[PDB]
């Protein structure tokens, strides 16, 4: 009947942030750390192997070194928590924790990762000064795949051309718009993706003297 309990079986965590994952195990009176054993794993990858108050660091995975730690402090309350920071995307997947202290049980938990596209990069250039043909360009990086919607100041949608591609596994999304326009005409690109439905809208203001390429 000795059982391990996880307060949350889900984690939706944004790229590069930090998260603590929690496991709970019965403790009465004071915790004997000689007799405590913890293991943290993610798919085929060990993460921590904590035997006898001493965390075995020869065996932790390469991809985790100096990133994810077992908080040694909470344990005394029966809470053995994995602390990872700078959530790296390839951490998305199913973890599971295993506690042998007098008895043993394990519970698995999963975590997925977002990466909003909220830093948008603009470029505005003329390609044909006579026809006033300009080229509006938004790019941005995130996870999972995104799509790009172009809109005129008067809120009409317009046809763009976009390219999705990879950075590590990150998505790089470029979209350009070729439309005749003049100075001080404002246009918008909004980046909309799925998963945790999210959107980020940039404003592009045509300059009097745009560059050309």
């Amino acid at each position, epitope marked *: 009947a000795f059982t391990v309990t996880v307060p949350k079986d889900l984690y939706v965590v944004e790229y590069g942030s930090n998260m603590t994952i929690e496991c709970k195990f019965p403790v009465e009176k004071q915790l004997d750390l000689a007799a405590l*054993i913890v*293991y943290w*794993e993610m*798919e*085929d*990858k*060990n993460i921590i*192997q904590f*035997v*006898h108050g001493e965390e*075995d660091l*020869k*065996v*932790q*995975h*390469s991809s985790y070194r100096q990133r994810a730690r077992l908080l040694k402090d909470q344990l005394s309350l029966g809470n053995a928590a994995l602390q990872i920071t700078d959530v790296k995307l390839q951490d998305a997947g199913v973890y*599971r924790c*295993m506690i*042998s202290y007098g008895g*043993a049980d*394990y519970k698995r938990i999963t975590v997925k990762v977002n990466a909003p596209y909220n830093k948008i990069n603009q470029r505005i250039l003329v390609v044909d000064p006579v026809t006033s043909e300009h080229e509006l360009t938004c790019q941005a990086e995130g996870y999972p795949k995104a799509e790009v919607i172009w809109t005129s100041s008067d809120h009409q949608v317009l046809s763009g051309k976009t390219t999705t591609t990879n950075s590590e596994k990150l998505f790089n999304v470029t979209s350009t718009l070729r439309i005749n326009t003049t100075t001080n005409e404002i246009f918008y690109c909004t980046f909309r993706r799925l998963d945790p439905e999210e959107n980020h809208t940039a404003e592009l203001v045509i300059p009097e003297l745009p560059l050309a390429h």
Partner: antibody
Amino acid sequence: EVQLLESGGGLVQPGGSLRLSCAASGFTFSSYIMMWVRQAPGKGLEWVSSIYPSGGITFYADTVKGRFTISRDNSKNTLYLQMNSLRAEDTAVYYCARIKLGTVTTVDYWGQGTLVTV
Amino acid sequence: SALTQPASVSGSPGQSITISCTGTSSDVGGYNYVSWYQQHPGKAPKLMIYDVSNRPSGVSNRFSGSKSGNTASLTISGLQAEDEADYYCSSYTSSSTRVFGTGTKVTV
């Protein structure tokens, strides 16, 4: 610089008992996940049992659940498999496989086996 | 539960050859952990590559590995006659288990 020596297998009746051992020489065996893997003659190779270094966490393949039990003495740096009421389908070669550090499931070094015949 | 490896392939010296390993959305096609093992008959299986392509120090560059979608492939180059042996692939699985392949027997 590493050796894994299976010993104890032989001819036993169906329903009998056999204790398979694995002598382990090599890296610090108190830190490794260890495993048993069986090869039926000519056939594919299947995983039977896992054991974590310490804490006594073990795992068994569904065919084998309940009549096989695995153990390990981290001082004597060896590994055992107790086989009870051997069925007829349980007759195959038995390998003792060390799990590469970091990786939960990936063996790297193996021993040469020992025969079990039902 | 098994990984399907075509049992019969073969080829002559100084040549390239590719064994195939296929499996489910839940094991070889879902994870980047697939390991390949080389053994001559009645001998001591040798890890050759791991984690889809990675090979440990001490395996000739003549061995690389590849995973395309659901299907994974072990390639031998500069092929020689010692390398004729039963070879197996393997993968982690959603059950936190390693499935192994039926094995292929390459012959020089």
